[PDB]
Nucleic acid binder design. Structure first.
Lengths: 191, 208, 128, 126, 380
RNA sequence: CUGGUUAAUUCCGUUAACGAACGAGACCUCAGCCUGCUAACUAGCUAUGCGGAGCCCUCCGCAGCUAGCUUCUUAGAGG
């Protein structure tokens, strides 16, 4: 067997509980998954399931960027990798499973676009088509970790682990869950 | 770079001497120590004059100017191979009416109206405003085909320019022409090149 | 056993003088011909002809090898002024083609020079 | 004897493989693989096919890649070993095929057109 | 030799001269070759002793060429079949199991020309690229096909369209090529020993898409091309391209000799396949599907091959079937039909084994089948 | 005008029109233009040596246009 993925963690044991979200969360690729970094142009066809994924690719990838300045994906891959081992040592559970718990908790069911029509501006609440859920969620988890790292003596690999474990536990301490249920609260109300 | 310099320095010198000049266009190839300078011209006569002093004094200058090596030179006469594709005379002849005038409009059509008659397939003549010494109004008229730009790089367009110092006022210009190409046959116009065949019944016929 | 210092001596032939004879054994040989034009289409055709000539002469020299590229690309917003976009790359190659013979006879030099096909091709007989 | 070289290419930098089959040691610039690319995840991209296959001792790969950064080096290195095997064995055609092969990519840096502050993000004004 | 239909006369003096010369030479030749034709094979064949059961079926199904399988030729040992495909790949297969021994990534697309050497050593193919590259076969485990002293033997102006070995290695090439010319070559050196160049009818002026080597001494060879002629060229002597038939309306996109050597089957792209008798020098037989109802997607087309006995012609067409014919009788023995259950595709090549036991068909659908007959009579 | 399509009076299908130019595309350009090769070697690989190194087994260096071919380099063709 000899599982790879940084050479320490499996990924075909990782369960996605939300059936709708699961069918867009690729933990398996054409031969099986891996995480080793690249890119691969498949564009953006619509209606249907429409792309292949990796969460782990999105998450490091949110980190290099958000936030902010200066860093690189080699640094970002390193921080995800450090955050994943910090997560495993504080949960004793596969950190790929813990990011899936964080993404499902941090991925709002409904969202709230701002439309001007007639003489005024309404927001009537909208869909959030599941790649957008996955993302809002990752981003908020990353922006939280970034924000926590800016203003605390806590490595961000730790801060990412800290935000990710709080989100993957429903804890309103997390920026990502707190913004998720803020968004669902406005989207549910503005009808 | 230094091999480059010589092409550029030489090219201007051959252009300036070969300016107004009532003759017709002027290649130069400069082989080790010698200049061919090929003039395509009727009034080959004034430049040569045989033996004398004439032929050498103009040359000699170029050498002492910027170039090269303890010798003499050579000079050859030519004709010209249906004039369009390059000259001076073509340019000057329209200036040689744009001296004294003549209906300005007539020259435009007229210089174009010739050349087409010798084939040309398009020709575009173009003249600077300040006709009647009023405000500018540049003129066109172009007949037939003709392109410098869009079609392929190898349409083989003669295009030039010239200038006209009238008394009162400049009358620019830029004549263009696209005809057959440098005398030996080697037509290739405007991509695609079509051709099929007619028929085919067959028993003898084809390549195509 | 051991003790190796390696030279060439097949005999004969090496790149520094490609030995041939006679004329008191020819001790001349190293010529380099570097032929530099604007346009390729013309060059190639001249270049091939040199290769052929060597082949005829007695002892066969190698064909054209055409090496590395010289660009000056200068882009000016030509002017207005003000002109500061939709500016310009007119970009200029000049190309260098270096053709040897294995043996540089008296006879080679003289045939090659007399009838020399350069129109725009600038070709320098060279030189120790 | 044994030495089969099929030369891939995909990004700048050139990998010549002459492979004589034995124990699974890996060289680059004729120097040991993990240690030359010490501290890298992209280094283990290469390592992927000299484990996973169920062949370990069947490839001693001797690799030289010359000229460009740390990152580039892996993607090429890999391709070659697969392609060579496919020619001999038609049953390990499903070795080449299912484990990913073949991208030039062709998206290595792009033209710089004028006005661009980088090349393509035209000025903040004008 | 082929009667021409009444055509409306023109009243020009100059042409009559044209008719004069042309008709004077062709009728004078027509009265000698024609006389030898005692009967036609079909007429004579009526009161024949019968054929045995035909029982070919696909015994095994093979796969591995990347693109469309263009061409095949079987090896003399009865065990290898090669084959070349548009991707540039050349595969040598042993057919029964179907194991792949060798593969070389050869070069061009349009590499529709793989042949087996009489020795068994080598293959040639080539196509777009303008060369034929040779390759020895070895037992070596490593199998880099590409280096083992290959060689670009040939240079043509245009695209190699056909190649074939004679009965020997020493004359490894007899070619007719897109460059138009046809050429005989000496192998090691690669020099063109001689060139044969002739005409529009007659020689071939246009591209040779096939030629086939005559079976005997192999004194002559017949070629086929677009100029709509089947032209045998006298290789052995002065090389006046010797004897010609131009029966066809359309390309004779193919040409294959009988094992007897007596006939060749002209498979052409024009909506018939025809058989031409080289010895008598007249059209012996016509293979055509005369009723308006009996039409397929395309009428019959590109390629032909013979049984060892010569009784059967198995043929590939663009329409995707094979109609099997009794050559002598003129009957169709049978229809063979293969693969899809809707939508067409070319069957471009079909080639007999050396022992004659079986045939391999390659198709654009990207599959191969080998059909075989075992036993004298029906199985079991 | 229309009907459709497309970056594109782009092409098609209609039409009181039938053409026709000029832009666009095509074209020369560069990105991967590669690829098996034809071409030569800068150079690469590879061979053979030899100065040594670990303890010709393994490894570095350079040696001779010395041997050949090649991803590099390079021009072409095709593709």
């Amino acid at each position: 067997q000899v599982v790879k993925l940084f050479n320490c963690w499996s990924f075909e044991d990782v369960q996605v509980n939300d059936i709708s979200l699961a069918d867009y969360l690729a933990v398996s690729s054409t031969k099986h998954a891996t995480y080793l970094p690249h890119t691969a142009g498949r564009y953006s066809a619509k209606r249907f399931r429409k792309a292949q994924c990796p969460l782990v690719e999105r998450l490091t990838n949110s980190l290099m960027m958000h936030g902010r300045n200066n860093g690189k994906k080699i640094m970002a891959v390193r921080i995800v990798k450090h955050a994943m081992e910090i997560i495993h040592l504080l949960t004793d559970a596969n950190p790929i499973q813990v990011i899936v718990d964080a993404i499902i908790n941090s991925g709002p069911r409904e969202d709230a676009t701002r439309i001007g029509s007639a003489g005024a501006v309404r927001r009537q609440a909208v869909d959030i088509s599941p790649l957008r859920r996955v993302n809002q969620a990752i981003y908020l988890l990353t922006t939280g970790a970034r924000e926590s790292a800016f203003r605390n003596i806590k490595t961000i690999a730790e801060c990412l682990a800290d935000e990710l474990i709080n989100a993957a536990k429903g804890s309103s301490n997390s920026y990502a869950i707190k913004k998720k249920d803020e968004i669902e609260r406005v989207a549910k109300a503005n009808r | 770079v230094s091999d480059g310099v010589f092409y550029a320095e030489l090219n201007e010198m051959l252009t300036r001497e070969l300016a107004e000049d009532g003759y017709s266009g002027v290649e130069v190839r400069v082989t080790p120590m010698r200049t061919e300078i090929i003039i395509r011209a009727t009034r080959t006569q004034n430049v040569l004059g045989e033996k004398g002093r004439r032929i050498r004094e103009l040359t000699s200058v170029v050498q002492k100017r910027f170039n090269f090596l303890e010798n003499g030179v050579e000079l050859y006469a030519e004709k010209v191979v249906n004039r369009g594709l390059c000259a001076i005379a073509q340019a000057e002849s329209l200036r040689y009416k744009l001296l004294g005038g003549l209906a300005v409009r007539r020259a435009c059509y007229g210089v174009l109206r010739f050349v087409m008659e010798s084939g040309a397939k398009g020709c575009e003549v173009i003249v600077s405003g300040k006709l009647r010494a009023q405000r500018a109004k540049s003129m066109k008229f172009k007949d037939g085909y003709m392109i410098s730009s869009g079609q392929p790089v190898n349409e083989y367009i003669d295009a030039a320019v010239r200038h006209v110092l009238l008394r009162q006022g400049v009358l620019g210009i830029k004549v263009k022409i696209m005809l057959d190409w440098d005398p030996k046959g080697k037509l290739g116009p405007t991509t695609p090149l079509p051709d099929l065949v007619t028929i085919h019944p067959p028993k003898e016929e084809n390549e195509l | 056993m051991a003790a190796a210092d390696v030279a060439y001596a097949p005999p004969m032939k090496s790149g520094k003088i490609g030995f041939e004879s006679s004329q008191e054994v020819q001790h001349r040989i190293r010529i380099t011909l570097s032929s530099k034009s604007v346009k390729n289409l013309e060059k190639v055709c001249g270049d091939l002809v040199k290769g052929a000539k060597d082949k005829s002469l007695k002892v066969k020299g190698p064909v054209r090898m055409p090496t590395k590229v010289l660009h000056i690309t200068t882009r000016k917003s030509p002017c207005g002024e003000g002109t500061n976009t939709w500016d310009r790359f007119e970009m200029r190659v000049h190309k260098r083609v270096i053709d040897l013979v294995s043996s540089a006879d008296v006879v080679k030099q003289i045939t090659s020079i007399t009838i020399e096909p350069g129109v725009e091709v600038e070709v320098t007989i060279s030189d120790q | 004897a044994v030495s089969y070289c099929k030369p891939g290419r995909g990004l700048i930098k050139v990998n010549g493989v002459p492979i004589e089959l034995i124990r699974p040691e890996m060289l680059r610039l004729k120097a040991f693989e993990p240690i030359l690319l010490a501290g890298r995840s992209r280094f283990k991209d290469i390592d992927m096919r000299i484990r996973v296959r169920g062949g370990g001792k069947t490839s001693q790969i001797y690799a030289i890649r010359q000229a460009i950064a740390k990152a580039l080096v892996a993607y090429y290195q890999k391709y070659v070993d697969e392609a060579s095997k496919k020619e001999v064995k038609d049953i390990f055609a499903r070795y080449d095929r299912t484990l990913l092969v073949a991208d030039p990519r062709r998206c290595e840096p792009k033209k710089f057109g004028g006005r661009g502050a980088r090349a393509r993000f035209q000025k903040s004004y004008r | 030799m082929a009667s021409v239909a009444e055509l409306k006369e023109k009243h020009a003096a100059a042409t009559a001269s044209v008719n004069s010369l042309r008709e004077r030479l062709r009728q004078r030749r027509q009265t000698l070759l024609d006389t030898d034709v005692e009967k036609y094979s079909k007429a004579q064949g009526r009161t024949a002793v019968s054929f045995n059961p035909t029982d070919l079926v696909c015994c095994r199904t093979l796969q591995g060429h990347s693109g469309k399988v263009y061409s095949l030729d079987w090896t003399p040992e009865k065990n290898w079949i090669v084959s070349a495909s548009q991707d540039g790949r050349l595969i040598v297969w042993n057919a029964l199991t179907s194991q792949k021994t060798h593969a070389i990534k050869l070069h061009c697309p349009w590499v529709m020309e793989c042949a087996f050497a009489p020795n068994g050593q080598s293959v040639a193919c080539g196509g777009l690229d303008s060369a034929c590259s040779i390759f020895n076969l070895s037992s070596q485990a490593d199998r880099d096909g590409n280096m083992p002293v290959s060689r670009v033997l040939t240079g043509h102006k245009g695209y190699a369209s056909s190649c074939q070995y004679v009965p020997d290695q020493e004359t490894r090439l007899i070619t007719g090529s897109g460059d138009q010319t046809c050429v005989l070559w000496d192998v090691t050196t690669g020099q063109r020993i001689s060139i044969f160049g002739s005409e529009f009818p007659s020689g071939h002026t246009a591209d040779v898409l096939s030629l086939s080597i005559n079976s005997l001494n192999a004194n002559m060879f017949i070629s086929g091309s677009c100029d709509t002629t089947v032209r045998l060229w006298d290789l052995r002597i002065t090389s006046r391209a010797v004897r010609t038939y131009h029966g066809h309306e359309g390309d004779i996109n193919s040409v294959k000799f009988f094992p007897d050597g007596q006939r060749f089957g002209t498979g052409s792209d024009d909506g018939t396949c025809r058989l031409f008798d080289m010895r008598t020098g007249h059209q012996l037989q016509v293979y055509n599907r005369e009723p308006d109802r009996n039409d397929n997607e395309l009428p019959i087309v590109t390629s032909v091959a013979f049984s060892i006995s010569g009784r059967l012609l198995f043929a590939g067409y663009s329409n995707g079937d094979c109609y099997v014919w009794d050559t002598l009788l003129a009957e169709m023995v049978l229809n063979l039909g293969t693969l899809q259950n809707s939508h067409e595709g070319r069957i471009s090549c079909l080639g007999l084994s050396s022992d004659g036991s079986a045939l391999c068909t390659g198709s654009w659908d990207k599959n191969l089948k080998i059909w075989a007959f075992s036993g004298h009579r029906k199985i079991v």
